[PDB]
Amino acid sequence: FEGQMAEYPTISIDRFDRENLRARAYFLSHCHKDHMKGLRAPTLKRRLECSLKVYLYCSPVTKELLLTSPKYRFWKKRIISIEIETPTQISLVDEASGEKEEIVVTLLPAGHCPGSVMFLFQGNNGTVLYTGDFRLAQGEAARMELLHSGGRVKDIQSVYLDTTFCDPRFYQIPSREECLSGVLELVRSWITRSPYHVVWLNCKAAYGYEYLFTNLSEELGVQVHVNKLDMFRNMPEILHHLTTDRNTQIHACRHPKAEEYFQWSKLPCGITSRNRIPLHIISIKPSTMWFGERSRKTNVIVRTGESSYRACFSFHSSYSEIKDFLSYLCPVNAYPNVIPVGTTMDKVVEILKPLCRS
Ligand SMILES: CO/N=C(/C(=O)N[C@@H]1C(=O)N2C(C(=O)O)=C(CSc3nc(=O)c(=O)[nH]n3C)CS[C@H]12)c1csc(N)n1
Ligand code: NI
Ligand SMILES: [Zn+2]
């Protein structure tokens, strides 16, 4: 996926370079780097300065997060949030020939990271859904009222969908709740032993772990150490569960060579003792795990060393979830947004084919 859906080529979503430089309107599903290619390129800025009626649309949270970065503040005058599950009419003007197109857009929650949404577009060339990145459990799409008309799913011409784990190997992934419970109980069994027992959550430098931090903090009464928390300045229910102070039993700090540090009983922020008593440190790396069709779930926690663990965590839907979602949507066409590492377009397209009307 390179930004443009065939049905509405004058809009660009999650890609801002190359052909997307002529967009009549821009959309951002969420603040992950690989969906923000070109979003602050000079050539785009140049183009915004001679095209005054071009806006960027996203969720309220996405607006807030994007605008906390100094490098995207230039968007301030041109960003419009759209409320979640609130169908909103948008006008797309031709800068030169003066053509006018109207589209109605509805934001649906994607379950991927703070601010993450799917965009349902309705207009005079059919209904389309761009999912962005999503993780939706079975039944979640069936509950989304604005995907339906008169008790049946809307007629959807094309779905542009997150196919990150769209291969039958990734058949099942433990739920959000199961992942959280496993991590909670591992952390609780360690940090309640003494004040000197500490956990390092080894996380990627990306939004989407806040669900985990918030819940661990709420349940355990401990704030989580992070490198930077200023992006949540106006998000109290996230902010108050994080800290920049090193004196805490849960850390999600980050440092360029941080797994070497852990192999010498140092956390990334450098704290190794308190009252000259060494901290007893375990590492927990949230990581995607999956089970095949014919298997049962195994433990969300995998022990990798005396003091090291992997914990199930997924930003994206399983293959069974993708199939259930698309089966339910029953669009005419389905377009993979991404080719999983070990497969091809043809295999992914052909996996999806039987779930579509043409
Ligand atoms: C290499 O180190 N790996 C992991 C780990 O477990 N990674 C998982 C793996 O193999 N994954 C897959 C995928 O298949 O690409 C991905 C999908 S790639 C992607 N996801 C987005 O949401 C997005 O917006 N853009 N992009 C490009 C997620 S990580 C996961 C890790 C976890 S924590 C930590 N410190 N390292
Ligand atoms: Ni993402
Ligand atoms: Zn730390």
Numbering used by the authors: 4 to 361
Quote from the publication.
The results show that neither cefotaxime nor 7-aminocephalosporanic acid inhibit Artemis, whilst ceftriaxone inhibits with a modest IC50 of 65 μM. We solved a structure of ceftriaxone bound to Artemis (purified by IMAC) at 1.9 Å resolution in the space group P1 with one protein molecule in the asymmetric unit. As before, in this structure Artemis possesses the canonical bilobar MBL and β-CASP fold with an active site containing one nickel ion, likely reflecting the purification method. Ceftriaxone binds to the protein surface in an extended manner making interactions with the active site, towards the β-CASP domain. There is no evidence for cleavage of the β-lactam, nor of loss of the C-3′ cephalosporin side chain, reactions that can occur during ‘true’ MBL catalysed cephalosporin hydrolysis. Electron density at the active site clearly reveals the ceftriaxone side chain coordinates the M1 site nickel ion replacing two waters (72 and 106) in the uncomplexed structure. Despite the conservation of key elements of the active site of the MBL fold nucleases and the ‘true’ β−lactam hydrolysing MBLs, ceftriaxone, does not interact with the nickel ion via its β-lactam carbonyl (as occurs for the true MBLs), but via both carbonyl oxygens of the cyclic 1, 2 diamide in its sidechain (Ni–O distances: 2 and 2.2 Å), i.e. it is not positioned for productive β-lactam hydrolysis. The amino-thiazole group (N7) of ceftriaxone forms hydrogen bonds with the side chain of Asn205, while the S1 of the 7-aminocephalosporanic acid core of the compound interacts with the hydroxyl of Tyr212 through an ethylene glycol molecule. A notable difference between the ceftriaxone-bound Artemis structure and the non-complexed structure is the loss of a metal ion at M2 site, normally coordinated by Asp37, His38 and Asp130. Without a metal ion at the M2 site, as in the ceftriaxone bound structure, the Asp37 side chain is positioned away from the active site, as seen when nickel is bound in the M1 site.
Artemis (SNM1C/DCLRE1C) is an endonuclease that plays a key role in development of B- and T-lymphocytes and in dsDNA break repair by non-homologous end-joining (NHEJ). Artemis is phosphorylated by DNA-PKcs and acts to open DNA hairpin intermediates generated during V(D)J and class-switch recombination. Artemis belongs to a superfamily of nucleases containing metallo-β-lactamase (MBL) and β-CASP (CPSF-Artemis-SNM1-Pso2) domains. The overall fold of the catalytic core of Artemis is similar to that of SNM1A and SNM1B (2 Å backbone RMSD); it has all the key structural characteristics of human MBL fold nucleases, with the di-metal containing active site at the interface between the MBL and β-CASP domains.
